[PDB]
Design a protein around this motif. Structure first.
Motif, PDB file in Angstrom:
ATOM      1  N   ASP B 432       0.947  -1.183   0.154  1.00  0.00           N
ATOM      2  CA  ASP B 432       0.036   0.078   0.040  1.00  0.00           C
ATOM      3  C   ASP B 432       0.909   1.205  -0.030  1.00  0.00           C
ATOM      4  O   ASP B 432       0.983   2.258   1.069  1.00  0.00           O
ATOM      5  CB  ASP B 432      -1.009  -0.016   1.176  1.00  0.00           C
ATOM      6  N   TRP B 453      -6.382   0.734   3.942  1.00  0.00           N
ATOM      7  CA  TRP B 453      -5.873  -0.100   3.047  1.00  0.00           C
ATOM      8  C   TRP B 453      -5.211  -1.141   3.646  1.00  0.00           C
ATOM      9  O   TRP B 453      -4.590  -2.096   2.924  1.00  0.00           O
ATOM     10  CB  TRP B 453      -5.203   0.438   1.982  1.00  0.00           C
ATOM     11  N   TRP B 460      -2.673  -3.628  -5.690  1.00  0.00           N
ATOM     12  CA  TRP B 460      -3.488  -2.764  -6.185  1.00  0.00           C
ATOM     13  C   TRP B 460      -3.184  -2.257  -7.648  1.00  0.00           C
ATOM     14  O   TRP B 460      -1.937  -2.312  -7.962  1.00  0.00           O
ATOM     15  CB  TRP B 460      -3.656  -1.313  -5.187  1.00  0.00           C
ATOM     16  N   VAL B 471      -7.813   3.408  -8.482  1.00  0.00           N
ATOM     17  CA  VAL B 471      -7.052   2.233  -7.949  1.00  0.00           C
ATOM     18  C   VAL B 471      -7.893   1.106  -7.663  1.00  0.00           C
ATOM     19  O   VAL B 471      -8.892   1.442  -6.798  1.00  0.00           O
ATOM     20  CB  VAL B 471      -6.419   2.747  -6.486  1.00  0.00           C
ATOM     21  N   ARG B 473      -8.715  -3.038  -6.525  1.00  0.00           N
ATOM     22  CA  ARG B 473      -8.023  -4.063  -5.707  1.00  0.00           C
ATOM     23  C   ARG B 473      -8.016  -5.182  -6.579  1.00  0.00           C
ATOM     24  O   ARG B 473      -9.013  -5.553  -7.354  1.00  0.00           O
ATOM     25  CB  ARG B 473      -8.855  -4.248  -4.471  1.00  0.00           C
ATOM     26  N   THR B 483     -13.631   0.219  -5.459  1.00  0.00           N
ATOM     27  CA  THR B 483     -12.834   0.962  -6.597  1.00  0.00           C
ATOM     28  C   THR B 483     -12.526   2.371  -6.152  1.00  0.00           C
ATOM     29  O   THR B 483     -13.549   2.972  -5.941  1.00  0.00           O
ATOM     30  CB  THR B 483     -13.338   0.848  -8.036  1.00  0.00           C
TER      31      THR B 483
END
Ligand SMILES: O=P(O)(O)O[C@H]1[C@H](OP(=O)(O)O)[C@@H](OP(=O)(O)O)[C@H](OP(=O)(O)O)[C@@H](OP(=O)(O)O)[C@H]1OP(=O)(O)O
Ligand SMILES: [Zn+2]
Lengths: 369, 511, 135, 514
Positions: B432, B453, B460, B471, B473, B483
């Motif tokens: 992250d 996160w 990501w 960004v 997942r 999202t």
């Protein structure tokens, strides 16, 4: 005159590898269908190949592997996980219904052609169904289950002192070269692309071992070789091989995946450049065997193999395609010959000259017959 | 040199002379304020400067100092077109080469550096302005770039105003702009959803008496184009072994909705999005050679030329400048890293080979920037036959076909994803962390990230769409599809609604 | 390149004195279905093929396979052509509609197609699919 | 570049310009010379008037900065008179200060050295010290002693000390030696003088010059006298026509330009590489296909000794000796399967253990290896291309042994192929096919071809080069029956003199070690 025996079976065209699998054996059916319409079958003896039993296939492959192949079915797929891991059957070579029937048809065609050719009844034997040359002794690879080129060669060795195997498929004939890597009775010459390509073998320095030293020839090539370069590297090397080795039979693997526009191949050969190799080999007046294998753009494969069977009979054929069952498949140009692509030839003159000179230096050390 | 002998007679060139001179000048001019010979007055503040360095740095000061006027010979010179802070910043830049650029006074620095002919600072201010343009001041930047004859900034402002033409409709500065600016922004090609006809009719209706004659010219010069804010998603369902290609369309409301969905019967090793077309590579793989092209309108699959070599985990980079798709690095089936570079011509459907990479990497992150391809991260070839996570930077100049590895190194290593935004490369790695990479200045600026996160250490995927950074997942929970939209100006994060796709595994996210 | 008894083939030895015996003792492992005849005109064969294809519905291969059965006798083959029906895969209209639905649903997965058409083998389904895709 | 938290490219960030220094330097040079504007201070030397800028002078030299900031009226005076520096040398200094390049030459070198020391121009002073250390000879080694001692320069002093102690016997009758200060003589004899120079004769002559004042220093001079043995050598390894065993000859270089054989030795195996470490010779050999045996030859005993075998099999690899770490490095080479190898391994004499280090950028085989203050240079050789074959190579690869990091220089050699290199002073002399000799300076990154007499053009034969006491000897690879040509090369004038006193029954000279 010249007698040609052609081995076709109407059942080999009904086997499906899977969804989106590159190798569709149905390409053989329209290859025959073009043959029936050009009128080439008038001058050709057509035979139906018998189903070779597992005893005929054990001459090279291990017995347990063939037992697995004849026992494996898609309905009991989960019961042989260890076998699939051991025998490399799976993503490369999917399990489909009629797997062993397809293998039997291919190897029966090759062995029957070798026997008929071995009795001096015929001079050229044509078997497009077979030609699978990637399968190893105890594991399948490269869409090839049972290596039938090696079985055909082993059948020829019972009467011919020396048998020369010629490859023109884009990939290296690793199965047959491995099979005869320590033998001076079989010389395997292969023209292929080197680099990252499957299977990443056939280096220039691979010239056999033991008694078979200098008896295995590899010509590593590059991307986008054209007709002129392929002819200029095929004719002299073949002339030297036939002069030094002096064989008594020729087994030619007329792989059609070296053409311009395949799904997998990256060469630039046209149909004329491909048929020039077969015409050159056929002119040496030796007991000769042609098998297919390879080729993944089906229409190009059908055109190429129809031309190959046409040049075997020394029969000129029209460029236009006559009406047949698969007429719509060849559109919209509706012509037999295919044009080359705009691919840049990466085979520079110096590269080919150096490779050819190295091969000539290797061939001089081959002992006189 | 053949005529020079290192024992009797030869020439000596000092490679550190320029740096030594610059450092000495900076130290003698700032720290002690010695050898000052000209005085500049700005808003009552007195600056003691050296005419030599000023004249060597800019042409305007040289012209003013070499003149025959008494003012040039006068010790004190007054300047009224600049402020105190801006002129102090300019003197700092001239004497040091390091200037702190702030958005509040960027317009003033841009105007003044143009006035004083400081080329490098003008170019950097133009780039900063092109980054900072939004819908709020797009026409003001249009006016500024047209006044100062700056083509790059003018083009950037035109691109930003053209794609938001509908929103600019009800602004006074849109109605008041001259005919030439409107012609330029319209003839560039307005997307169909923006309704340029409404813009034309409103501009005409602002003042019918003095503007009706331009209707025919505007309509003749009008050109219109279609929709490409597409973000392509390649994934595999939990219950299926085939690949699903989902294309999302981004709205002005910041809602993302699915516009289409395709299914492919083959596994995919790499993918890239060229223009509006999606290209995927994968061949039931001990054989990464086949390629298929998907067009949004057709909703089908077209097979392209196979790869000249079969490699795993290569990087596919789309280069619209040369209309080519580049495949860089990647592993081999024998687990040996490969440094071969091959590019595919979309027009001719023909592959070609170019100069190999300096260092072989696999699974790198490829970013295209003004025709230069950057290979970020990956896995180097460790000397002891294994592979290690890498952090080196490789620069591939497509115009020259010459590659070179940057002496700098990334803050992190391993697998990463790169998204190009404006003039920067945003790279997201494991753990992250988000890094904003500026290749011109070659510096990093880590972006703060919310603590939410940290629940899971999942990777990501980052994608850029119409000036917004999204960004994603990699792993989606059942019913949990998150999202995150990122605003790079304030480092804010906003959850986006409207996305519900049964994609358990997001293999690739393409911008 | 691997070298070992578990990889290479067992090449038999060559005995020159044994050449004339093994071949004459081995049967031809193939069934002959057609052989060229030099006493037959091409025009007559073309006319016979056209008649078989049009009047009786015989395909290209079956008509010539039947012609060889009478030792290249055109008159006997023509006389005996209506006596034998060239048995096809009896795909009715309902069968064609069902196969079209199966292809629309499950695609080229013929194992799933066989579930809804148990009377048709996988080989028959594959043969029909390639002929059906022409249209 | 650190990842700054408080800097972002959309609100606030720091813009650093990397072309600013070059732009400022170029602009200031152009303005100060081509246009001659903003002249501020005036310098007069020997009646010639120069216009200079106090800013540049104070930026590059501290002496001028201190001189210009003085409160005396002379600093504020428009004209300033300098009487220590000649006009031409000051013109050269102004050229260096403004432009940054200067045409150094041997006639003005000492004056430029002294003045650059006075004006505190560190870079020019260091380059002048290096160029003065390069050109030191037996005829002016004591003058360089005195100069470097006055100017507190350790590198030049060490080089002059080495040159003077290695030629002490020739300085016995020199007038400068008789007037040498006692401290200088103590330093020159305490550093370690070879016993062949007869240092005791030098001390006796120095005392006998003025006994009434130098008698008290006799005991101190004798007690501090340190002596070492004798091994000025150039090993020649080759094969005779009538024998299949390699024969190694160790030649001794006399002070009168005569090379005499000191001994010979024979080894009963083929050798693929050789190097000279200190006073000892090391060879790598072994029968095909196992050439991984080391043999160490001691000149004192003329005997062979076994050493640690090579970690891996290689052919045509380069062996260099690094006395800084007391190690022997093996660079590049070919494998037995005809494949170029980039593996690097180094052998420690003290520990007798081989160790592998980082690999090269591009693998080479048969390239020339030269040592330079611990940095190993690989020159020429063969590189593999298109695609399994080898091509003559011209790349220069630098191997820094301190950081174990290797690089490739952007420039390339004027030629390519096999070559032999011998380090001389600070320069690398390379000789290749075609009678070509190139003097390569890594510091300035430039090459100078050396003209060579047409006597080399009689036959197209390769040449081997070696260095001995600062003298460059070049040998012919092929010796005709009764013909053994050896040339002493003087790089100052590119003069070639035929040497005598050498009898050698070698036909092929495989290696020449120095
Ligand atoms: O030769 P075409 O008429 O162009 O069509 C073929 C055919 O598909 P369709 O008949 O459905 O168009 C193949 O499918 P099968 O006949 O084997 O079922 C399919 O191969 P896959 O089934 O393996 O996907 C192949 O596509 P591809 O080469 O991309 O695998 C595709 O050709 P096109 O790619 O030209 O559509
Ligand atoms: Zn193939």
């Amino acid at each position: 005159r010249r007698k040609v025996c052609y081995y076709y079976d109407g059942d080999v065209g009904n086997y499906y590898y899977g969804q989106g699998h590159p190798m569709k054996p149905h390409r053989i059916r329209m290859t025959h269908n073009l043959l029936l319409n050009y009128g080439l079958y008038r001058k050709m003896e057509i035979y139906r190949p018998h189903k070779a039993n597992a005893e005929e296939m054990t001459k090279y492959h291990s017995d347990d592997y063939i037992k697995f192949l004849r026992s494996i079915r898609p309905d009991n797929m989960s019961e042989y996980s260890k076998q699939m891991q051991r025998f490399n059957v799976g993503e490369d070579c999917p399990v489909f219904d009629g797997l062993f029937e397809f293998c039997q048809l291919s190897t029966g065609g090759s062995v029957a052609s070798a026997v008929k050719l071995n009795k001096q009844q015929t001079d050229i034997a044509v078997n497009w169904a077979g030609g699978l040359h990637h399968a190893k002794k105890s594991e399948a690879s490269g869409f090839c289950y049972v290596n039938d080129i090696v079985l055909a060669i082993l059948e020829l060795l019972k009467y011919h002192q020396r048998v020369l195997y010629i490859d023109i498929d884009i990939h290296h004939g690793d199965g047959v070269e491995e099979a005869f890597y320590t033998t001076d009775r079989v010389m395997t010459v292969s023209f292929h692309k080197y680099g990252e390509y499957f299977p990443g073998t056939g280096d220039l320095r691979d010239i056999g071992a033991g008694k078979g030293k200098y008896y295995a020839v590899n010509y590593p090539l590059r991307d986008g070789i054209d007709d002129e370069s392929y002819e200029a590297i095929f004719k002299p090397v073949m002339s030297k091989v036939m002069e030094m080795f002096q064989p008594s039979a020729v087994v030619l693997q007329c792989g059609s995946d070296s053409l311009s526009g395949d799904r997998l191949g990256c060469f630039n050969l046209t149909i004329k450049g491909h048929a020039k190799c077969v015409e050159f080999v056929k002119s040496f007046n030796l007991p000769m065997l042609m098998l297919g294998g390879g080729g993944y753009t089906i229409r190009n494969v059908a055109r190429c193999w129809t031309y190959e069977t046409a040049v075997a009979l020394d029969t000129e054929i029209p460029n236009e395609l006559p009406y047949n069952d698969y007429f719509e498949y060849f559109g919209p140009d509706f012509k037999l010959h295919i044009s080359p692509s705009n691919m840049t030839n990466q085979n520079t003159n110096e590269y080919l000259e150096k490779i050819k000179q190295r091969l000539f230096e290797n061939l001089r050390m081959l002992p006189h017959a | 040199s053949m005529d020079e002998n290192y024992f009797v007679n030869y020439t000596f060139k000092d490679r550190s002379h320029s740096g030594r001179v610059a450092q000495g000048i900076m130290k003698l001019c700032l720290e002690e304020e010695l050898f000052a010979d000209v005085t500049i007055s700005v808003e009552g503040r007195e600056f003691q400067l050296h005419r030599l360095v000023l004249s060597a740095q800019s042409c305007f000061f040289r012209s003013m100092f070499t003149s025959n006027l008494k003012e040039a010979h006068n010790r004190v010179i007054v300047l009224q077109d600049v402020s105190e802070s801006v002129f102090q910043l300019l003197v700092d830049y001239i004497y040091h080469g390091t200037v702190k650029l702030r958005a509040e006074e960027l317009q003033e620095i841009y105007e003044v550096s143009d006035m004083y002919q400081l080329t490098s600072l003008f170019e950097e201010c133009s780039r900063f302005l092109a980054r900072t343009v939004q819908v709020g001041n797009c026409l003001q930047v249009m006016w500024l770039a047209d006044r100062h004859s700056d083509p790059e900034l003018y083009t950037a402002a035109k691109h930003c105003a053209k794609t938001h033409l509908a929103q600019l409709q009800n602004t006074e500065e849109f109605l008041h702009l001259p005919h030439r600016l409107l012609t330029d922004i319209i003839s560039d090609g307005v997307p169909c959803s923006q309704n340029p006809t409404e813009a034309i009719e409103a501009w005409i209706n602002f003042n019918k008496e003095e503007r009706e004659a331009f209707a025919e010219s505007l309509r003749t010069s009008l050109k219109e184009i279609g929709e490409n804010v597409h973000i392509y998603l390649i994934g595999k369902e939990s219950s299926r072994t085939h690949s699903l290609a989902v294309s999302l369309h981004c709205a002005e409301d910041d809602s993302i909705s699915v516009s289409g969905q395709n299914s492919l019967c083959h596994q995919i090793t790499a993918a890239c999005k060229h223009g509006g077309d999606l290209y995927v590579v994968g061949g039931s793989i001990p054989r990464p050679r086949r390629m298929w092209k998907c067009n949004n309108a057709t909703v089908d699959w077209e097979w392209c030329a196979p790869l000249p070599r079969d490699r795993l985990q290569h990087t596919l980079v789309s280069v619209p400048g040369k209309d080519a798709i580049y495949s860089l690095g990647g592993k081999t089936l024998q687990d040996t890293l490969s440094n071969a570079v091959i590019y595919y011509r979309v027009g001719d459907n023909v592959w070609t080979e170019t100069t190999q990479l300096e260092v072989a990497v696999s699974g790198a992150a490829g970013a295209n920037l003004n025709g230069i391809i950057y290979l970020l991260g990956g896995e180097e070839n460790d000397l002891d036959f294994f592979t290690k996570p890498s952090r080196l930077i490789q620069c591939f100049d497509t115009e020259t076909d010459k590659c070179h590895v940057k002496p700098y190194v990334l803050p992190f290593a391993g697998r990463m994803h790169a998204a190009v935004h404006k003039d920067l490369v945003f790279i997201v790695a494991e753990g992250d962390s988000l890094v904003c990479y500026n290749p011109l200045l070659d510096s990093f600026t880590r972006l703060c990230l919310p603590e939410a996160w940290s629940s899971a250490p999942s990777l990501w995927k980052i994608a850029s769409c119409n000036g917004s950074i999204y960004v994603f997942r990699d792993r989606y929970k059942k019913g949990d599809a998150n999202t995150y939209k990122l605003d790079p100006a304030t480092s804010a994060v906003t959850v986006t609604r409207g996305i519900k796709v049964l994609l358990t595994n997001l293999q690739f996210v393409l911008a | 390149m691997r070298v070992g008894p578990q990889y290479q083939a067992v090449v038999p030895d060559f005995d020159p004195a044994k050449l004339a015996r093994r071949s004459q003792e081995r049967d031809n492992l193939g069934m002959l279905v057609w052989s060229p005849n030099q006493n037959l005109s091409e025009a007559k064969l073309d006319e016979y093929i056209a008649i078989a294809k049009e009047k009786h519905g015989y395909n290209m291969e079956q008509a010539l396979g039947m012609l060889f059965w009478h030792k290249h006798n055109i008159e006997k083959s023509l006389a005996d052509l209506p006596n034998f029906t060239p048995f096809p895969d009896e795909w009715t209209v309902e069968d064609k509609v069902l196969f079209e639905q199966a292809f629309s649903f499950h695609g080229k997965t013929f194992h799933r197609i066989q579930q809804m058409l148990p009377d048709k083998s996988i080989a028959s389904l594959v043969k029909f699919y390639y002929s059906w895709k022409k249209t």
